């Protein structure tokens, strides 16, 4: 209790009943929103991958909570800060996750999971403290959760009823209207130190380091000696992300197109500018930024004759299975992947593929960007 | 050099009212009660967060301004119904709106447009044809009611322009019936010569204050002018706040012998203060315990009550801003002052001049004139004057310094309930 | 005696004659074997009022319940003693009734017993807020006589009515052939199942001229086309008219041509020559009286024709103005005021059909001016005689006859548009379904149409009707789509929501109210909507029957259209504030449910691998991503099925298909509309919406470039071929311009002078004004307003803006020092016209187009995608501050500019704070010594940026307008202020709040020691900078950052009030 603290945050766990009343900064608002979105997405991924009672689930969830600095263990100023984070972020996400029933459900599920986890970490004393502060062994959590869920649903309804007051705040519209579709990985626009890649290496990379989304495009570029706009962008930007320099890319594409229905002059007049912009820092931020998994999955769905997109999403399941068979991946693994695809856990499916191809049970990272994929592959060499 | 050797020191350049002796004396603020005019609306006394204006909020503020003034005028004139400005009108209809210019230049008789409010016109505009109006005086942002016809649906032709209606004067309470006449000395910045930062004119004015012992001294900004040649070219060796603190200390400490209530009004040209209108009061100076009751840091604009006499004051150069845009069919300053009084705002010009930053929510909350002031202090780059506009004594004391040469100040005597002659006498005098 | 007549219109004058309503219609006369107009006066319509008893008697003086149970005898006694005598009510009939109430007045039970008092209309009117000790509220005080009559006798729209014991009027009250009076409203009964009679339709057009002196419009010609037997249930006749008349007048000292009479006679037409406007108006009134049209159809008749007619009648002092209507009126109606031009009832008893309103209701068009309607509905061309030519037509008889024939052709076009749209049968069906007056059906706007449906429904179910008062958008995904595009009509969204969720005045408690429980039975409003939907379904099923009479097919089609229109318009009763049934809670609930449905539909379509490129409560635009039409239809059926699964009552239809679509905005696109001809083969037609350029000062070069770009986009080619062709043409045009192979006539820019050139406030920035001033200075024909100035921007070696370098073509050919400014003609004429169509294409930007044209791209350089790539909150510092000005400080010693963009400068052990050493190697001055000057410059820069923000400069988002103004107009669209130069695009802030916030954040960033050490600086550099020898610099940087922190603390953009968000 240094300067401006109080008894507003007695216990770690809370039912999130009283909205915050403070005046925070826009930077704090955005940071809290994104951090809790990362936490909830991690919760969802771990729930899909592992059994919620498993020790792996607990270890990974504790690691994520420590990384994002959220309350997980049972009043020092720092502790107070964390709790405040939790309290504000939650409501921010409420504002983000009340527009559509689907979203609401998703939010609720994740929240419940988190709450359960936290309850599992409460010592009996602390547990009783909680049960007192809110005017309330293995089975008790269930009842608590039931109550929580009731409350939360009600709250979300109320939030959906109070949406018009928030839409007028342009500052918060881009975030809240699109938080569910917000990329939460690392940045690849600024290469900084991406290493030096020779063109001769690229083919070899496509064997094992390129994720399927890029691999397919590579194959097309080496078969038809041409890619359509979508693909041109996707793949080229990926190449930028893996370290190809502008000159290098100009050579690459040049040769490829020159191998069919294109001469040098044409490449200079029609296509070169594209690549140049891909390597520039002016545009709409979709021209020089390597595309993320979500960008590839939820935007620009390929049409017939278009070889871009996410294979785990935009390819017919049966076809995908055939493709995996062509890669000689063990049948059981294929089944796993397909199951994940049926759950719309496309990124996770890709992750499983990675784990199989590199023969590592645990990859040690969460897949959210093709370039990340590549980098991890190279780290495993 | 030029200022120090001037020969017209103390010359009375303008006079109004009862003739007084060659020397003026005051009560040293003994039987004086100075406060902010207690109206329905709360006054601006502290900084308000700014730099965040939504276009919707500006639209709402402008529309409600038009609507409120039009409602008052409709009740006063017993007008039956207002009609949408944009709709065609074969017969004569009464329309409420605000004047504007169809382009970015200065308004002229062939570039006038009337924009209606959201309630009666959905915010639609219409060109105006002033061929059938025999007499008019229009400036942008002026809320007007006109009788006219729109036969083509594309050009409104006014035939009558309703006159403005000023607010009623203040009815003072008897609490100040026995108080004596109060002396007020008002001066406006800049207070230092163009090529100096020593505040010689301010020292002369402080000497005048201590000599005459006025009851109130109204000092209007700027106190550290942003257009001062030294300030713009970055030749100052001390921070702006330090120069302003030195100036305020000089003013307050130097006026200690006079015991005179000081009313400090900020200016948009104050390089050290927040550049927004309505301007909040200065808050970077804490007067000593012996001067707290004497110094009044007020906002721009300010409505002051002095023993029941209501004095309106603004540092903004309203006459210069509106003189550049007012168009008339055939005294121009008197017309502009009457426009200000009838619009009931300390800044009715829309869009504003290029030199003023307007926060429109604060403008809506704080610019409205509570009543018609007994005295209206309006410093201007234009020539000094003392005019009687609809019973209000509008005083332009000029500026204390005019470039390299000394300027002028004003002194007037106010008593509540005198004779309506609340202003006994007034004089624009040289420094 | 029984009087059978088919009624069409009704008129009520509450102020003049209380309790009397006039009904106008058709009566069959055997002596003439024809239908004639008749007016029936229904008098003695009693005021009906309902007094609501209290639970316990209340002393009005004290307002405290007395605890005495109040029977209805107490209410009767109080009314007879206190209310009756206090308001001069002599005779009345009281009764006990049971009524329901579920509307917006607090403390009225859902069902209760009321005291119904009926008393004559000549007695005074009780106050609306009347209250007594025994009764709490009074309902129906201001109910109109016509409403009481229609609801009492169950009269639903035009129909055959039988009158028992009709009387004869003492004196004529109408301009109708037959008159009758009924003493009691109960004598009028509704006959059923009989066919409507034919009606007389008169299509009216008139030519007027504006008087520059009197500022009034003088009617100079009138043409009328009359059909005496017009069907309301059959197909429109061919030809649409039988007779016609025309009247022509001289324009007040504009004498007729010498042989006007001979030419008119030779024309062998029904043309009447009037020597004055007064005679013309008298002739017109006489003809309207004699013909006696049941329907008068015109274009802008309510807003222009009728108003001008009345003004010219009262200006020329023409008697018997009321002959325009059917009732004998002495005083002209009050001006429109708030109600509007239509709700003035100038032609009382005649149905006035304005094809503008009817077209706006029944057909979509780019504009609703008569020429556009003629082009779109009749596929014809309409000739507009310029105003300056109408008065010049009085020089030759041929020109005058041409003007009169133009008026006749306009009347013919109006009648043809009315017949083609089937406005009258549709109006009849809508009136019958709703049960209102047909005149108000054809008036449109705020006139009562569906309020009457609800009134009938509630009255039939023992309700006390209220007294008369006295949407998420999925923003367009701008871009080019070479795949088929599906348009789905969601107009049935709100009625479907009302049905499915049982939203009603009786099922929802009145913050958005919670949905009614499923246990509740269907409400009245959902029941009415269900009845309409089921009726339309039944009519459609009957239509599906093969081998059916075409006449019955047309009847069923009209009925189905009317049912759909009524069902879709039902929501307005709850939503519109002016609505008689306005219920803010119900409208809010319906809107919220609509939002939910729209978002869920977007999610479904996305899950189907398709793209929703636009969405509004009325429509959904989806990207099918298919090259086959059969697959497009399959996907449409699949989308309909998926939607219907989650919402059974939401029935969707395909409104159109586009093969290609360049979309910039709803109402702003180019497309290839697909009309399928059956068997998998279709025809494509170009459709450009909202691509017209308001500004007409464009050189032919730019116009041709834009036309070619649109032609390339609207070709069936893939994206790559289109882009290649566009690049080819742009490079060709640039090379031609730079090679001087372009004809000079194509560089000419024509602009109209709307004022005297000296009267333009912005004359300096206007080139056509410059040229006009030059022309006037020369000494030839002076150029006044209305003149067209032609100019070419030429380079003359003057270092003056393009506006000043504007020259007439002859001057360019003569001077020999003048050359065409090719750079201007490529950057300011071709580039905007081309980029407004090419920028939406992904991969093409303004810089690329400039490069192709041969210019310098340096001079020309979606929230969903930003989120997909990180969002606005996860940007790097370089990208976050790339548009911010860097801190410029001039060294006091050497005077060289120092640009600061980071806290630290250099790499490795050579890294030091930026303000430690001057940028000039020969300069040893340390800016850290002059930190007072740095502070002052920082404050001045902050003042400069705040001034820039508060300048409030707005620029039009349209490339072809780019209007720059300081004035914010009160006229707003859904997107923001509407630009007053073009009236079709939004004004955007030149320096938005985000720009100022980011600038201040950047100035804080360039002085943030701690942040730079953690993020920007490396490890070895951090170690080298985290020692002594920099503590003083650290302190000075902290002090400098304190200034920007102080400024930002006073900014509202940097603070979020969580109290306002969560409540
Ligand atoms: S999950 Fe990401 S990396 Fe894997 S195939 Fe899809 S887009 Fe590529
Ligand atoms: Zn230097
Ligand atoms: Zn515009």
UniProtKB/Swiss-Prot annotation, chain C:
Q: Name one GO cellular component term.
A: nucleoplasm
Gene Ontology biological process? DNA replication; DNA replication initiation; DNA replication, synthesis of primer; DNA strand elongation involved in DNA replication; double-strand break repair via nonhomologous end joining; lagging strand elongation; leading strand elongation; mitotic DNA replication initiation
Residues represented out of the complete protein: 339 to 1452 of 1458
User: What are the protein's GO molecular function terms?
Assistant: chromatin binding; DNA binding; DNA replication origin binding; DNA-directed DNA polymerase activity; nucleotide binding; single-stranded DNA binding; zinc ion binding
> Which gene name belongs to this protein?
pola1
Q: Which residues bind Zn(2+) 1?
A: 891, 894, 918, 923
| Source organism per UniProt | Xenopus laevis
Q: What is this protein called?
A: DNA polymerase alpha catalytic subunit
Other notes: In eukaryotes there are five DNA polymerases: alpha, beta, gamma, delta, and epsilon which are responsible for different reactions of DNA synthesis.
Please tell me where this protein is predominantly located. Answer: nucleus
**Where does the record place it?**
Nucleus
Q: Which family does it belong to?
A: Belongs to the DNA polymerase type-B family.
Q: How does it assemble?
A: The DNA polymerase alpha complex is composed of four subunits: the catalytic subunit POLA1, the regulatory subunit POLA2, and the small and the large primase subunits PRIM1 and PRIM2 respectively. Interacts with PARP1; this interaction functions as part of the control of replication fork progression. Interacts with MCM10 and WDHD1; these interactions recruit the polymerase alpha complex to the pre-replicative complex bound to DNA. Interacts with RPA1; this interaction stabilizes the replicative complex and reduces the misincorporation rate of DNA polymerase alpha by acting as a fidelity clamp.
Q: Give residues annotated as binding Zn(2+) 2.
A: 956, 961, 979, 982
EC number, as in UniProt = 2.7.7.7
Please give the function described in this protein's UniProt entry.
Plays an essential role in the initiation of DNA replication. During the S phase of the cell cycle, the DNA polymerase alpha complex (composed of a catalytic subunit POLA1/p180, a regulatory subunit POLA2/p70 and two primase subunits PRIM1/p49 and PRIM2/p58) is recruited to DNA at the replicative forks via direct interactions with MCM10 and WDHD1. The primase subunit of the polymerase alpha complex initiates DNA synthesis by oligomerising short RNA primers on both leading and lagging strands.
Question: Which intervals of this chain are the motif CysB motif?
Answer: 956-982
Q: Where are the zinc fingers (CysA-type)?
A: 891-921
**What catalytic activity does the UniProt entry give for this protein?**
DNA(n) + a 2'-deoxyribonucleoside 5'-triphosphate = DNA(n+1) + diphosphate
Note down the stretches annotated as region DNA-binding. 312-377, 859-984
Going by the UniProt record, its keywords in alphabetical order are: DNA replication, DNA-binding, DNA-directed DNA polymerase, Metal-binding, Nucleotidyltransferase, Nucleus, Transferase, Zinc, Zinc-finger
